[PDB]
């Protein structure tokens, strides 16, 4: 047990990071392009889709940096300021993406309960909500903004981009932040999204029980259930790992094998959250029946230009 | 199986006195070359060198 752990996995991590990066950087780019200059704005849920796609886009834009970081086996070349900026930027876009998923589920719930709310829906109120969500994500990324720095790890002989908690009370701090990551990153959003899904399913189930209404209603129900299932699938492993890590920092679990498994699996789970950010555009923007026709129109844009 | 549990103890030992208790249990199990090696690891636990006694008892 007490023997030093394995390093076999680090060969595959950067390549996977690049795969996820190119996939999400294409898909999210497609979404943001359809929204940005091409007409299609002026809807609240649409504004939310755009902001989520921007958060995921700028989020995966940092994946090459982490793939290089894992390629050089934790030796950070770009400097301490870059470690600060891109760590806090990463955390900020994680919180923006997750908070935007929650905000879109809340928007769907409050649009299902209230059938008489127009699509404009006081668009300036969304022009106030979007900065509110971004500011909440910033405030939640303040710990990562204060502790993500470059420190010299002598035993690895490596200038690593880590969380630079006070080494006297390092472990404690780690545990704390881990729990915070669980609460502000999974627990509260999971509660919101789950309750919203349950309520939406209930109201729908009442409204459109018979006929073609039942068919389309079951489709939309599978859409909301698919939202919750995607979030859970691509965020439960990471947060379970961070919770067990928090237990280790506390000292409840000290087994060498368990902690070695935590550190072995953690980069994969981080990548899994990033794959959630990559998958969201398929789940939210590409589902509309107007999307495929708009895609065929974009595809024929240069042909008509000829 | 008792020797396996006391071999878990040293890796999970809080201090030297837990190592001493586990090594005395192994000594009683042995009575129920290994005896001499355990009698030396018991010395290492009594000295207070906790980490070195853990390494000796793992052997």
């Amino acid at each position, epitope marked *: 047990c007490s023997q030093k752990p394995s*390093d076999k996995h680090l060969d595959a991590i950067p390549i996977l990071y690049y795969i996820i990066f190119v996939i999400g950087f294409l898909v999210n780019i497609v979404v943001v392009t359809l929204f940005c200059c091409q007409k299609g704005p002026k809807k609240v849920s649409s504004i939310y889709i755009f902001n989520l796609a921007v958060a995921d886009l700028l989020l995966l834009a940092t994946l090459p940096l982490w793939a290089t970081y894992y390629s050089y086996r934790y*030796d950070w*070349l770009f400097g301490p300021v870059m470690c600060k900026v891109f760590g806090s930027f990463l955390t900020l876009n994680m919180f923006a993406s997750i908070f935007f998923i929650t905000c879109m589920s809340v928007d769907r719930y409050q649009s299902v309960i209230y059938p008489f709310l127009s699509q404009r829906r006081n668009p300036w109120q969304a022009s106030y909500i979007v900065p509110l969500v971004w500011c909440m994500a910033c405030l939640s990324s303040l710990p990562t903004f204060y502790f993500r720095d470059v420190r010299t790890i002598e*035993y*690895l002989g490596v200038n690593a981009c880590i969380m630079a908690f006070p080494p006297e009370k390092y472990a404690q701090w780690a545990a704390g932040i881990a729990l915070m990551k669980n609460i502000l990153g999974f627990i509260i959003p999971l509660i919101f999204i789950a309750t919203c899904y349950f309520g939406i399913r209930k109201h729908l189930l009442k409204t459109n029980s018979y006929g073609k209404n039942r068919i389309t209603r079951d489709q939309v129900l599978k859409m909301a259930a698919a939202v919750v299932l995607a979030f859970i699938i691509c965020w439960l492993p990471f947060h379970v790992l961070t919770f067990l890590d928090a237990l280790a920092w506390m000292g409840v679990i000290n087994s060498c094998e368990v902690i070695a498994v935590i550190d072995l699996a953690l980069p994969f789970a981080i990548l899994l959250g990033f794959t959630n950010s990559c998958v969201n555009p398929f789940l939210y923007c590409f589902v509309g029946n107007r999307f495929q026709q708009k895609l065929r129109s974009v595809f024929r844009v240069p042909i008509t230009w000829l | 199986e008792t020797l396996n549990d006391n071999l878990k103890v040293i890796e999970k030992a809080d201090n030297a006195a837990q190592v001493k208790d586990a090594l005395t249990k192994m000594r009683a199990a042995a009575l129920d070359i290994l005896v001499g090696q355990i009698d030396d690891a018991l010395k290492l636990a009594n000295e207070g*060198k906790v*980490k070195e006694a853990q390494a000796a008892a793992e*052997q």
Partner: antibody, heavy 120, light 107 residues
Framework: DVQLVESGGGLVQPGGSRKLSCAASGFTFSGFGMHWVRQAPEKGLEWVAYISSGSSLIYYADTVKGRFTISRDNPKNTLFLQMTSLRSEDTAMYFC?????????????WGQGTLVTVSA | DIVLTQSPAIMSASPGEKVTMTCSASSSVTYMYWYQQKPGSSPRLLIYDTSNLASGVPVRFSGSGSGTSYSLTISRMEAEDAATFYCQQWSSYPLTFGAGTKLELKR
């Protein structure tokens, strides 16, 4: 199968300069730290310097610090050690060694070594 | 700046005997490593992190120690084991080596 090969040895007058090179094969080079470690004739081993994978962390021995410069060429899988103002005590057999594990301060895989003599 | 003194400098050991050499540091050292070097060949890592058998090292070798006192032990002396044994400390760079111990096969 890991192979490290040193080269660049020979006879240098006191105060000269000499760049030793180390070629590596059999592993991903730009993931681990490399050390230079010399051994005096009929004497024991002595750690000289160390450089990380992306050359961000560099350590020198106190008898070497300020006079030598360890460097790295990752695209070509090479480890360089520029020696300047050589002394009689620097006469030794130099090795490039790595732990092949995150650049930890030990030496699992040793090179063949190259001899450097300092005498006029 | 940590000085490593090994004991003894020379020792004869017949095949099958138990060999034990010591390595003492002037200050508290975090980790100790043990290398075997035969005349003409490069050293080979025997023990890393003061008690962990390195990959490929026979079971006869075993490292131990803590604080300022460490030891390398061979359960059953064999012919291939006759070489010079070095200890290297790590607590903070720079790294320092030991003076060495010559293990001669008693004939």
């Amino acid at each position: 199968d890991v192979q490290l090969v040193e080269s660049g040895g020979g006879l240098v007058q006191p105060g000269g300069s000499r760049k030793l090179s180390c070629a590596a094969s059999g592993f991903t080079f730009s993931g681990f730290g490399m050390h230079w470690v010399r051994q005096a004739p009929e004497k024991g081993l002595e750690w000289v310097a160390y450089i990380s994978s992306g050359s961000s962390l560099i350590y020198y021995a106190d008898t070497v610090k300020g006079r030598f410069t360890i460097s790295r060429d990752n695209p070509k899988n090479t480890l360089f050690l520029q020696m300047t103002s050589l002394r009689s005590e620097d006469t030794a057999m130099y090795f490039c060694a790595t732990s092949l594990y995150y650049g930890t301060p030990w030496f699992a895989y040793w090179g063949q070594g190259t001899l450097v003599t300092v005498s006029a | 700046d940590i000085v490593l003194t090994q004991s003894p400098a020379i020792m004869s050991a017949s095949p099958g005997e138990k060999v034990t050499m010591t390595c003492s540091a002037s200050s508290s050292v975090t980790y100790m490593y043990w290398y075997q070097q035969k005349p003409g060949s490069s050293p080979r890592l025997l023990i890393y992190d003061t008690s962990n058998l390195a990959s490929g090292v026979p079971v006869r070798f075993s490292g131990s120690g803590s604080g300022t006192s460490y030891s390398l032990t061979i359960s059953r002396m064999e012919a291939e084991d006759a070489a010079t044994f070095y200890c290297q400390q790590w607590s903070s760079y720079p790294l320092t080596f030991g003076a060495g111990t010559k293990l001669e096969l008693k004939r």
